[PDB]
């Protein structure tokens, strides 16, 4: 019996070739393999994992396994799996349920296949999640499983928000580590990852020249910062929208004009509030917010003909694709690339000029239309994931008495010392040489020679 | 009015012309003037101020005065005063003791003139400092004055470190606000300020082409980040040194090669530990650390002939200028520009090829050889200073009983809401338009429509 | 009824046609020529042998030539550069095309032969459109009687032009040519900005490597090397540049690059001792951009850092000594057009060996081999020039001229600056750009007509 | 020695210090000194020179003198002289008539002092010019002097246009070399020089932050290209205007929005044709064209309040400053910085908000408000000048028989081989290493191993 489901198992050899390359690009993660090999700190760990089934995730999975864990895996997005990576993991004997181009029903089924082994709840004791979907399903549908789970390690900004809401409401059942907010995650992956992979995805989907054209990036947090750079470095004229004036100040100082889709920044919900002159000149819009309906129906109506629309935030509801499905006709160009014809719902003229190009049906475009962030960037994120798994598994929350569990429910980050140790391995991967403080210098600035080098207030 | 000392009072009209321009470049600060003029929240405040006597400081001073304060002012660096600014402030009837090109004895005398009025301690009740020199003098020499002081507002990273050391040792006598760590200060002034003003100062001092040449920036905190950009945007080939691997990871991802002056980063004090091949190719070295002896004697010996050496950190001991004074002959090119001849102490050949060019005798180069950060950047820093002064003055720490002082004796930052309000005014100064969240969107991400928009953990 | 073609898979035609319809919207200069000249049919009677990368962009070029009255027979000028959906869409429109991605060399030559011959005999060709000179060479060496009836050659690329100029110098060029490459809207658009767009694109598609923070060496700093260096630097690479031309090297220095040679003091003595092994041992990526031979040589390949990526974006694969690598080292295909080359020996390799290089597109032009080459909106410039060049030579009717008049016209020329400007204006309008009109006084002041041309022929832009 | 006029001879020692530094930054020029010292190829040359009396020109002058020439010198702009450079040249016994801040009458008088020695025409036999003013004066007022002059070497685009017009009309009396169109001049000086010195000048004059603000650059030739980069690299949002669609295409591809000051690009001279919405958002306008009235009266009226206006083309008539003198009130901020009050001609309110800031009264801003291009860039231009002087002086046009003069009366550029030799010295100055072709490679591409490497048609 094959305890997996993937698109095509014959892609395994290709995937394995790419894993071998990726190992060479992931020194922090491979360093953890070597360092913790002897101890087997994840011996006895049974990890439910839900995160984009890419080559990078493959190296993460095999690191967890190399440190003693067993896992059962699914992707956290319908379009993000690399089928060769899924195949290589399945062929190594690891249960994985993932393919590129899942339906929503298949997506839920894949998560269910990780949770259930041979038709009963798996004896899971750890969770690794990216976006909170697996966390939500366990809490909603398998609450008894959480009695035996020691913790959740959550990858992404959106997932963390959802955890913090559960904690505030008293509905979170196990502790978590916010992996996102290690500096080697948030200020590496979220920013430089998107810098690498946004323009990549747009080129693969459309092959559009970007230089000389007008872009609007909605948001200027870590993803928006990286996204804006991805485009500006290509020669786009990028405008930035924000609701956060500090982030907007950064965009101004970084050389971007800060604009709103709405007249005076006020959305009244009508077309009259749209800055039609602005949107009529935009060739590309990218959403980066983790919020809802930031590229709304009225904005879509006002966009320049033939504009590209995409989202690089975690969930597709940043863009009102439901409005587009209800009202406009979709013409598939190729997979994950649709022309959306604004002439009506029922059919289209093949030579119509009044369309938008939507990438990945509004799902995470970097992963949907390309391969997401590169190995050398994901090295940081995933070294943090491994450290976080070790920490929570060692803490054994599920074995605490009921009264003490109540006291130990938290959402925490990894210590700065570990964040530094990850960064050092990343730096060495580039051939970088960090200088060691003399004793006198360390005394002068008030730190130990080995670090940590900054107070916890430091923002980098 | 005679209660001042400046280089040349006849420069006042020029200074006033420049203050009128700077007011138009400082909307956050001017907005505070207009908003608080009626209420006079600083009525009764008597502020000892020690910060670079520039045009920008002039607008700060006159804002404090417009809100009801009286001040006595000095510069916190011997080369940083703009004499026209000092003159304009003196001519407005405000006690100021500052000029460009002070001796160290004059520097101390100027601070003493703020502390003493007519030969006796002034009835000061507030302190505004940049670097901690005034704060140190008050604690060491005028402890009775601190009994009646409500707080200190400290501008810069180095000054904050000194406060935090005092707090750790139980020697801090009054509460402080860390103005540096507002995002609209640290991630504006320290970074973009240096981006603007480093290349500016080097051009004014040397008129050297930077494009195509090799630079080494020591440090990659906010100043090193801004400094590196200042140089790279001019076409320099910039290498970065760091002791902090997180900051080094950022430098790598930002497109810099990370190097150490020392073989394997080990600074053992020996000549042989210097990477002679590296230093022999460097045309410019810039120190940005806030630490001691980061451009040391052995590094200076190994630098390429005709290299420029400068420091943009707060204090001159980043570079071992004492070694250069003791051993090498100094030839003044023009004010704040010296050729340092490595051939010997006693005289030099006017056509010697083996020299370095030192800017501002190792003191902060942006202020020493140019005019420091631009008005529109200092607007952020100084709007924070004003808000910080208001907050501590209203809290009236000096008048609290002993038991209540114990609860308030701390080093704090301004609330994020105020940091955002400053940023908004900066954004509007650029013509930027921030978007207003809908109530549904604000609920979705868990914030009020008016902000604050981020949790206190957020790093931007 | 139409069968006069050979492509990978005709069922890709609908996809290709969807992409052509998008590309038309990205190519205003080319589409402007279609609309302007449709009525007049200036290429009526033209029979064009075409040899250029069978991409979507070439598809729009082909259909423009056809829309203006031409008939064509087409092949690609590179074994890896065809987009199969584009080839299919062209075949389905009834146009003879012989092209697919992943040709062998024998197939490549056969495809060119299929354009030249129709039903086993020389086609009644009267025009040539070429990219690199291979078709031009075959006609001159093997089909001289066909050249008697050919009015001209329009040549796309720097390499091809060099070959034409050599023929002209030797008195062996049989028909006139237009150097399309040296329109400013080609050379300083396509060769530079095209590579800026498509180099990093190809490297990402092939390897998915992070480029930021890593060390690159770009060999050459002409238009391709300039664009290539920018492609990498804009991604955060630390880029070093090599050049033999000191003017181009001066530009690289001023542009913010360190200028280095693979050889100690720039002198190759042919031995491994002349290699700067310390330099090459730190390089993660090398890119050749020269149009020259063996600029990434065997000794350089031996000295490169383990796991370095090697690629070429010049016209021909001999920039890199891949023959040395085939003879001496073991090739492991990662996926199509991506090979690990194991430096441990010829016969087999360890799957976990660390001492390999990654070669893209077997050393053939990487932007077209591992991605889709330049974007439509850039190729618009190049291809509007191709169309204008075809119109000009076809109208001149060189083949029909008497001997004495042929002597006067047998040359390699560029398009007039006025036309180069007209192409540029349509490109600018495509971006929504608004050019200012000179007043009469201003035009007089600088000595030009209000409509242009705006610069003397000496101007370098 | 009294045969000079400069602002202040006591600045000579400072000038000499700066010349000694500049020599180290000018390897091509110093290489020419060493190479040609023995031959003294300019022995007997008597050169009238008219070009910006900067430190860089000082090194040029002393190179000509070191190769045997005698000279008489003036500046080609009223604001471009560096008084320390003029002083150092006078103190070396060389006739120079130049100071910063000349009136137009003084400017003409200075040129006349070069032409006349001891009250009568000097026995000049060579001319070095920058802009054509000296050339025009010789042709119009001293035609008899041209009978004994062997040639003109002309530095700049505007000067060359004027020569080519003279040649076309049959009014040019001596041959010329177009120094501008060496690649090591035009594509070095005109572009990278302005990149270095435009932002420099704006900072020195105003100390304005540039990041985040809106600029409009009129022109995108070599100067406009370099100017646009100067601003964009600082984080300005730069828009570009052009009449040349090829240059406009380059601006688009380089990442700029191309706009016209006039609606649809049509300049009918009416206020109605101005794009007031566009100009109302511009904080900085820079003219780069070498044309007339490209920043016209109606544009000046429509500019955003407090916009900076400047010109970096050769002559001040790019901007309609005559209109501003006739209609608006000028308030000097400091030398070469004026607020132009749009409220009327006769007086102004010191606190008026409706003004523009004009730099250098519309004269070349880089030289007027800073020091022009850096030594290492001018090295290229001036090595070309020296080679051009050698070539024409050795040809001895004035002494040629009539039939041979006819053949040599032309405006020519230097051979590409020499352009390459200059570039090589510049590259070596950066520590750059050029590769030598193998014999097989040289054969393959059809060039000699030593060069020239490109055909004359090549545009770089
Ligand atoms: N695609 C990827 O590979 C990838 C990588 C990292 C994170 N993410 C996801 O991207 C999203 C953003 O993450 P982040 O770390 O940048 O978060 P963040 O909190 O740093 O930034 C989001 C920004 O959006 C802004 N914003 C919110 N509503 C807005 C509106 N209506 N208009 C304009 N701006 C608005 C906020 O002010 C904030 O600055 C999340 O969903 C996260 O999980 C995706
Ligand atoms: N000149 C200006 O206008 C200006 C502006 C703002 C702040 N400052 C001053 O600049 C200094 C730096 O401030 P900051 O905000 O960047 O502080 P920071 O803590 O953000 O950055 C300093 C960096 O230096 C690094 N460092 C320390 N010792 C080092 C060594 N031996 N080698 C290499 N790197 C080393 C640290 O790791 C740290 O990242 C302080 O003195 C501050 O007061 C100057
Ligand atoms: N891949 C593409 O899409 C594409 C696009 C346009 C042109 N091209 C091709 O790229 C090649 C280059 O074209 P180009 O327009 O840049 O030509 P170019 O003449 O402008 O530039 C080539 C440069 O290579 C330099 N060079 C030569 N030998 C060298 C060596 N041994 N080491 C270092 N530098 C050396 C030359 O000095 C020259 O500056 C040609 O083969 C051309 O056909 C490819
Ligand atoms: N300040 C300096 O140090 C310096 C340096 C080099 C040259 N220059 C001078 O700068 C000027 C420009 O020189 P260049 O080499 O760039 O010349 P150029 O011919 O390369 O460029 C000038 C550009 O202006 C454009 N133009 C003309 N009229 C225009 C209009 N009405 N609106 C918009 N664009 C218009 C032209 O199309 C052209 O592209 C000349 O006067 C030259 O002598 C000054
Ligand atoms: N123009 C300026 N006026 C006043 N302070 C300045 C200026 N430029 C930089 N600074 C300050 O210098 C400090 C370093 O001592 C920084 O914290 C910064 O706030
Ligand atoms: K990837
Ligand atoms: K300033
Ligand atoms: K393409
Ligand atoms: K200068
Ligand atoms: Zn996820
Ligand atoms: Zn200070
Ligand atoms: Zn070709
Ligand atoms: Zn001049």
Numbering used by the authors:
A (entry chain B), B (entry chain A), D (entry chain C): 10 to 469
C (entry chain D): 9 to 469
Source paper text:
By hydrolyzing SAH to adenosine (Ado) and L-homocysteine (Hcy), the enzyme SAHase (SAH hydrolase) serves as an important regulator of SAM-dependent methylation through the control of the SAM:SAH ratio, and is an indicator of the biological methylation activity of the cell. SAHases are usually active as homotetramers. The protomer has a three-domain fold, with two prominent domains, the substrate- and cofactor-binding domains, separated by a deep crevice. A small C-terminal dimerization domain locks two subunits into a homodimer by quaternary complementation of the cofactor binding site, where a tightly but non-covalently bound nicotinamide adenine dinucleotide (NAD+) is found in its oxidized form.
The Zn2+ cation was incorporated into recombinant PaSAHase during expression and co-purifies with the enzyme. Co-purification of Zn2+ with PaSAHase indicates that the enzyme has a very high affinity for this cation. Specifically, our kinetics studies based on PaSAHase inactivation revealed that a tightly bound Zn2+ cation acts as a very strong noncompetitive inhibitor with an inhibitory constant Ki as low as 15 nM. Furthermore, the enzymatic study indicated that Zn2+ locks the enzyme-ligand complex in the closed conformation. Our crystal structures help to elucidate this puzzling behavior by showing that there is a tetrahedral zinc binding site, formed by three highly conserved amino acid residues involving S (Cys85), N (His323), and two O (Asp139) ligand atoms, located in the active site, where - together with the H323-F324 molecular gate - the divalent cation shuts access to the active site of the enzyme. Moreover, the Zn2+ cation is located at the interface between the two principal domains and is coordinated by three ligands from the substrate-binding domain (C85 Sγ, D139 O and D139 Oδ1) and one ligand from the cofactor-binding domain (H323 Nε1), thus further stabilizing the SAHaseclosed-Ligand-K+ complex. On the other hand, the potent inhibitory effect of Zn2+ is based on binding at the molecular gate and arresting the enzyme in the closed conformation.
